[PDB]
Design a protein around this ligand. Structure first.
Ligand SMILES: CC(C)(C)NC(=O)[C@@H]1CN(Cc2cccnc2)CCN1C[C@@H](O)C[C@@H](Cc1ccccc1)C(=O)N[C@H]1c2ccccc2C[C@H]1O
Lengths: 99, 99
């Protein structure tokens, strides 16, 4: 698709057999989802944005479907205000910025 | 241009006759630039990022030059680590997300 930016670019993702809403976010290096339980072991990570750092949980090789495009990649879990799809998974599903 | 997302999407902007580098951020609602002096009076605002809220100064009716293209709109100035061009100005230059 082509998504213009007058509204937030929210798409629907499927992860863990659930459907969630997430923001497509070119300003985010990584993908962070709200507090959920995902399979397997986790490592620790701190990510910093505006307002400071949060401590999140890094899971690897997670399957997540964005607009019916399957990506398998690293997903962070933590107290983020919105689910954010960031560059590590945007590159996978072939996403560019155009003007 | 067609900007890919293997690296951060940094481009050159011009505001107040200064050249700056800044991030094309589809996840940002507003444009937030690093502490600098602008023409006009400002309203104060609280905007919230990933690690919580910061206080910014809001200037209206500001022209920025992004890769040639002019855009005018609200610009917030405040303690941000990186310069961020959000949706409010991304729309004016005709920016879209394509996959
Ligand atoms: C207006 C303003 C700019 C303040 N907006 C944001 O910060 C929004 C906030 N919401 C939330 C919100 C807050 C309040 C109200 N509604 C919504 C969540 C997403 N962001 C958008 C982010 O794209 C902003 C960037 C800024 C940045 C980039 C690089 C380095 C430092 C800062 C961001 O936070 N990116 C970071 C990031 C993000 C996720 C995972 C890893 C990493 C690393 C890093 O790239």
């Amino acid at each position: 698709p082509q998504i213009t930016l007058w509204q937030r670019p929210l798409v629907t993702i499927k992860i863990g057999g659930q459907l969630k809403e997430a923001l497509l976010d070119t300003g985010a290096d990584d993908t962070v989802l709200e507090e959920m339980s995902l399979p397997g072991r986790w490592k620790p990570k701190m990510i910093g944005g505006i307002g400071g750092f949060i401590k999140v949980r890094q899971y690897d090789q997670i399957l997540i479907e964005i607009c019916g495009h399957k990506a398998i990649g690293t997903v962070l879990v933590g107290p983020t205000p919105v689910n954010i799809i960031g560059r590590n998974l945007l590159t996978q599903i072939g996403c560019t910025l155009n003007f």
